[PDB]
A paper describes a structure:
Here, we report the crystal structures of full length [name] [name] at 3.40 Å and 3.25 Å, and its isolated C-terminal domain at 1.17 Å resolution. The structural data confirm that the N-terminal domain of [name] possesses a kinase fold, whereas the C-terminal domain bears closest homology to a subdomain of 6-phosphofructokinase, an important enzyme in the glycolytic pathway.
Analysis by SEC-MALS (size-exclusion chromatography with multi-angle light scattering) and AUC (analytical ultracentrifugation) indicate that in isolation this protein domain is a homodimer. Well-ordered crystals were obtained of the purified [name]-CTD, and a native dataset from a single crystal was collected at 1.17 Å resolution. The protein forms a crystallographic dimer with a symmetry-related copy, burying 1051.5 Å2 of solvent accessible surface area as determined by PISA analysis. During the process of modelling and refinement, clearly defined electron density for a non-protein ligand was observed in a pocket composed of the side chains of residues His190, His252, Arg253 and the backbone of Thr248 and Gly249. [name]-CTD unexpectedly exhibits distant structural homology to the fructose-6-phosphate binding domain of PFK, suggesting a common evolutionary origin.
Numbering used by the authors:
A (entry chain A), B (entry chain A): 159 to 281
Write the structure that this text describes.
């Protein structure tokens, strides 16, 4: 079956070369100036809470998975092993990490074959 | 005002480094095996007609502009000069060219500041 890859990255490091879709989340609320959140990542509960208190964050996740679901039946049959969705913020530590996690969890919940990767955190 | 750039490219040449959003259209009907269409581009009427006879082509354009419109108000105010939407097929000659053109025409019709670019055709 098609493997759905959800990856976060920082635009400052360049777009990942395996991406098929790229979504920029630099318009979402930015935790960069709260000093307590700066050293954390979007895997951490305070950063997730900072993001989820804003309505547009859940709406971005919901609308993005809905958009992808329009094409998924045709992609699952596109001579294709992978569908790679890359979520980018500037540094790849906070917003993109959280959003990629939430998308990956949503598609896992739908029974899809999924994998996540955080390009900045893995360094 | 925010300048909306719509660019086509071929994944075989790599993702353009100025892209903010990237949409893969390799699942749309492929004119590669009709020999009359192969040397043409998505600027040409026979290629546009080949694509537009399939319902999913118009739906992709409509759904993609609608998705972008969810975020445009927040992007038009993201300390941002450009919003660059890159549409990719394998070679960047047919599907991506057509789709980028149609998106650019749609946002021009809404009074947005727009520019188009076809990375493969310009070579």
């Amino acid at each position: 079956e098609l493997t759905m890859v959800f990856e976060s990255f920082g635009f400052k490091h360049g777009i990942p070369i395996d991406a098929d879709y790229v979504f920029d989340v630099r318009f979402l609320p930015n935790p960069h100036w709260d000093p307590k959140l700066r050293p954390m990542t979007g895997l951490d509960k305070p950063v997730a809470a900072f993001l989820d208190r804003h309505t547009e964050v859940h709406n971005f996740i919901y609308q993005t998975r809905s958009y992808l679901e329009l094409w998924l039946p045709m992609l699952e049959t596109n001579n294709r092993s992978y569908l790679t969705v890359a979520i980018g913020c500037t540094g790849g530590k906070h917003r993109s990490v959280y959003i990629a996690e939430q998308l990956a969890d949503y598609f896992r919940s739908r029974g899809k074959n999924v994998q996540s990767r955080h390009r900045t955190l893995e360094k």
